[PDB]
């Protein structure tokens, strides 16, 4: 008789219900941390599944420690287990393939394999809009990037740079973080002026003297509040009925309609010149199968853009003036070279003497080296995978998560990684560089292999395509503040430590230089 045992069985749960609301909230939560503990061991003999890293708390998993030091947490990883493993998120499983046979898994995974856009929709479509990035089909994407991407060739780069240059020297004449024409000497802080400069720059060349203007009057708060909308929160909290985020969805209603008002207003003038990426967009906006895109996708496409570029092009900025506050040779190296290209100043700075700037051009790409502004990127893998040369699957469901930032950071691949060289790129200060074969995956012909250790502007079809943009923005920024400033920290103070849990990985704040003017008597001319 063990009918008599299943008897007790249905005894046993009729005490169990009856047990006092003490005892059975702790077994509400007892019971669940004891299976889990059981998983993770009976998971551990699973030969065709990477190791997994083990985690007390459920569905929160390696949350904290990686969100803390991600870099930190996968070289501990990597020593316990090589270089694939998986590792449970705020109830995902993250399955990291480090290096660069990582940078080939991810980056160049079939189409059909990941997805990108299903691990980013809830992260930007309720900053940027609806209908764009990742908002639609990865075909509308590729298209959607040949658009911008034609907006952003060598002619359109050659009338930036005066635009560019004329939005710096006004900065340096009218903020109070500088007015060059009143003081000689003064403190910043680089989280402060780099954002401002940065989307004073982006406002003006890529969007316009109209929309460059309302960045001077209370439309700027808008921004503000876009800006905040934009973080990591969004992939758990994406819509909460919070403040933050009817300020945000109200910024992005708002800034969307001043674009589209241009856009209209263009386009009832016939005024569609080749001005700006809104020009372009408005004579090069139809995909393949003949959809035009609609008033409203074009402005989303242009916040998404230009919220993008925006985080990127000032964390890096930030970090340039950071690392070279404490290194007053490399600020004389650069100083020299400016006054080579440019005859002593005798010149006015154009895209090409940006080309002629190595010295310049290797000092962004050795700060994307040690600070890439994403840490981390994913695709949610849609049909199970197997990792070549290995037993691996990594099932449907799980995420596949690549980090070039990582191996930047590996003596490996860059000797003395955690020294900030410009030196390692001499005869090789080109953004970047495909090291042969080529492919087209909609928005033009970039490198086929990913194999490189050093991805700063990832791979594949999910590729940057503001690569140029950025050097020349940066280019003619440092170009300007090593021309007019010398600067250094204050006392007993150096680069600081990078925020990992921002969405990008942007200096610690406030990170603040002391900066003096090469010729104090200067002027900046122009009315204020
Ligand atoms: C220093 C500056 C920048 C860096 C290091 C950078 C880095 C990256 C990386 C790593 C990716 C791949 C993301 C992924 O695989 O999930 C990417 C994609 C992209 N970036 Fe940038 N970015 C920068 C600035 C910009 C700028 C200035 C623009 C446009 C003006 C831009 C537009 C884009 C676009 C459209 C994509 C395509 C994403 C996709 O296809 O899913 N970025 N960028
Ligand atoms: O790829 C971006 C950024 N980007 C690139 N180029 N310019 N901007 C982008 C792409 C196309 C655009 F049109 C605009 C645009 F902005 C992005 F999609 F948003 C993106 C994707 C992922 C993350 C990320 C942040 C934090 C993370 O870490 C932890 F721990 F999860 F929080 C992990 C991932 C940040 N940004």
């Known amino acids: 008789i063990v009918g008599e045992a299943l008897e007790y069985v249905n ?64 070289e501990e990883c990597q020593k316990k287990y090589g270089d694939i493993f998986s590792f449970v998120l705020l109830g995902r499983v993250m399955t990291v393939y480090l290096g660069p046979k990582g940078h080939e898994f991810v980056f160049n995974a079939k189409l059909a394999d990941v997805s990108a856009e299903a691990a980013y929709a809830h992260l930007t479509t309720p900053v940027f809009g609806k209908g764009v990035i990742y908002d ?40 109070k973080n500088f007015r060059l024409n009143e003081r000689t000497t003064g403190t910043i802080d680089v989280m402060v002026t780099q954002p401002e400069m940065t989307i004073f720059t982006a406002s003006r060349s890529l969007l316009g003297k109209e929309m460059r203007a309302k960045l001077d009057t209370d439309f700027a708060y808008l921004y503000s509040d876009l800006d905040k909308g934009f973080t990591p929160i969004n992939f758990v909290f994406p819509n909460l009925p919070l403040e933050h985020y009817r ?98 100043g005798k010149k006015e700075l154009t895209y090409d003497l940006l080309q002629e700037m190595p010295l310049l051009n290797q000092t962004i790409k050795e700060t994307l080296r040690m600070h890439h502004p994403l840490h981390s990127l994913f695709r949610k893998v849609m049909k199970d995978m197997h990792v070549p040369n290995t037993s691996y699957v990594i099932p449907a469901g799980y995420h596949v998560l690549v980090s070039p930032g990582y191996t930047h950071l590996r003596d ?51 590729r940057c395509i503001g690569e140029h943009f950025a050097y020349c923005q940066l280019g003619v920024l440092m170009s300007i503040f090593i021309r007019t400033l010398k600067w250094h920290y204050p006392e007993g103070k150096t680069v600081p430590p990078p925020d990992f849990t921002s969405m990008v990985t942007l200096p610690t704040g406030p990170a603040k230089i002391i900066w003096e003017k090469r010729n104090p008597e200067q002027k900046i001319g122009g009315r204020h």
């Open 136 to 175: 639609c089909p990865n075909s509308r994407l590729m298209e959607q990037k040949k658009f911008v991407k034609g907006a952003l060739t060598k002619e359109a780069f050659k009338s930036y740079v005066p635009l560019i240059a004329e939005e710096v020297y006004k900065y340096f004449r009218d903020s």
């Open 247 to 344: 300020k945000r969805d109200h910024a992005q209603k708002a800034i969307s309609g001043t674009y589209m008002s241009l856009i209209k207003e263009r386009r009832k003038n016939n005024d569609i010149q080749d001005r700006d990426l809104i020009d372009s967009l408005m004579k090069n906006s139809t995909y393949k199968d003949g959809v035009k895109m609609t008033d409203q996708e074009i402005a989303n496409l242009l916040i998404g853009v230009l919220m993008g570029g925006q985080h990127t092009s000032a964390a890096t900025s930030a970090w340039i003036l950071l690392h070279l506050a404490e290194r007053p040779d490399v600020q004389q190296e650069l100083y020299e070279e400016q006054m080579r290209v440019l005859d002593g």
């Open 11 to 74: 005894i046993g749960l009729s005490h169990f219900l009856a047990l006092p609301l003490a005892q059975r909230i702790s077994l509400i939560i007892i019971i669940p941390f004891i299976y889990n503990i059981v998983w993770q061991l009976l998971y551990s003999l699973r030969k065709d599944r990477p190791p997994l890293v083990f985690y007390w708390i459920p569905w929160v998993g390696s949350a904290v420690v990686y969100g803390m030091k991600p870099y930190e947490f996968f």
């Open 412 to 462: 490996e691949y860059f000797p003395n990684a955690h020294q900030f060289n410009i030196h390692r790129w001499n005869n090789d200060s080109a953004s970047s560089y495909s090291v042969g074969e080529e492919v087209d995956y909609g928005f033009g012909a970039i490198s086929k292999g990913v194999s490189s250790p050093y991805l700063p502007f990832g791979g594949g079809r999910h």
